[PDB]
């Protein structure tokens, strides 16, 4: 019974996309854990299998549909279903391998890719880095068709990998970061695709570090500042959770919240 959120690229607007992302964050977080105003994803440790995934059903103007499975612990796209086939990225560990057996349980054809689903591996397969892959509603429309045609040989591996790269950033990264959701809003509003700039790429690559820096901070102050990049590629130093409240929407669980040492 995993929850399903629907989005279509057909006639998508800033509003329909914002409703989608808000719904996905609503199914990822439980309200149990908020630190400095920033929600934390459920802890993997002890999380029951019936609560472990959400499903995102994507449809497009071509009238096709694919369903992505996201792990609630990290918002990671672990696989997808297109009609009678499902495809999963190579799991990180035995427990995740058992977990994905609980997805798409009726599907006639189940495959586990031999490669993992991280950006570095997908960029190698795609023959292109994130910085050279355009995002927006047109890329997402195209990516939905490409995932849908995989099983029949119509979609080549490099184009499947590029299509995952588009879906992950427009769904998981946008759920993780209001900043990235706003970057996608822009592209959808003007119907103008464009590759992510260094502000988007540095936020993506730093999500885990920022999650840990916030959770281990002293009252919000980082022991070690983290360097991000602005749009023009110039350095932006982060010393404190405060400047990230408009930027990061949710964190991956990294440590227990200390007992509130209150004055």
Of the listed pieces 49-57, 136-144, 202-210, 254-262, which binds ligand RS8 according to CB under 6 A? 202-210
Stretch that binds ligand RS8, among 73-81, 127-135, 194-202, 221-229 (CB under 6 A): 73-81
Nearer to ligand RS8, 176 or 185 (CB): 176
Pairing of strands 235-240, 76-82: unpaired
Sole binder of ligand RS8 in the list 74, 145, 159, 215 (CB under 6 A): 74
**Could you confirm whether 119 is annotated as catalytic?**
yes
- Is 87 noted as a catalytic residue in this protein? no
Give all strands (DSSP E) within 9-141, no chain letters: 34-35, 38-39, 53-59, 65-71, 76-82, 85-88, 109-112
Site map 131..170 versus ligand RS8, x via CB under 6 A: -------------------------------------x--
Q: Which residue is nearest to ligand RS8 (CB)?
A: 117
Distance separating alpha carbons of residues 13 and 187, to the nearest angstrom? 10
Residue 20 and residue 41: Cα distance in Å, rounded?
Answer: 18
How far apart (Å, rounded) are the C-alpha atoms in residues 72 and 24? 10
Q: Whole-number minimum distance, CB 258 to ligand RS8, in Å?
A: 22
Residues 140, 38: Cα–Cα separation, whole Å: 28
User: Residues forming the annotated binding site?
Assistant: 4-6, 11, 46, 76-77, 117-119, 137-142, 191-193
């Amino acid at each position: 019974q995993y929850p399903i959120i629907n989005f279509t690229t057909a006639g998508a607007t800033v509003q329909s996309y914002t409703n989608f992302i808000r719904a996905v964050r609503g199914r990822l977080t439980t309200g149990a854990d908020v630190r400095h105003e920033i929600p934390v994803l459920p802890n993997r440790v002890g999380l029951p299998i019936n609560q472990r995934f959400i499903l995102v059903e994507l449809s497009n103007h071509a009238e096709l549909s694919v369903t992505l499975a996201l792990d609630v612990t990290n918002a990671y796209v672990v696989g997808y279903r297109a009609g009678n086939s499902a495809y999963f990225f190579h799991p990180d560990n035995q427990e995740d391998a058992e977990a994905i057996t609980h997805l798409f349980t009726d599907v006639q054809n189940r495959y586990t890719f031999a490669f993992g689903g991280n950006y570095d591996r997908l960029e190698q397969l795609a023959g292109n880095l994130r910085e050279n892959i355009e995002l927006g509603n047109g890329p997402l429309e195209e990516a939905i068709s490409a995932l849908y045609y995989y099983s029949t040989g119509g979609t080549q591996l490099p184009t499947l990998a590029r299509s995952f790269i588009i879906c992950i950033q427009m769904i998981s990264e946008a759920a993780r970061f209001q900043y990235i959701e706003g970057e996608m809003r822009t592209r959808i509003r003007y119907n103008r695709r464009s590759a992510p700039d260094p502000s988007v790429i540095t936020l993506e690559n730093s999500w885990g570090r920022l999650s840990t820096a916030i959770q281990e901070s002293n009252q919000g102050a980082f022991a070690s500042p983290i360097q991000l990049q602005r749009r023009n590629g110039s350095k932006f130093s982060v010393y404190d959770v405060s400047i990230l409240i408009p930027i990061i929407a949710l964190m991956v669980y990294r440590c227990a919240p200390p007992p509130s040492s209150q004055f």
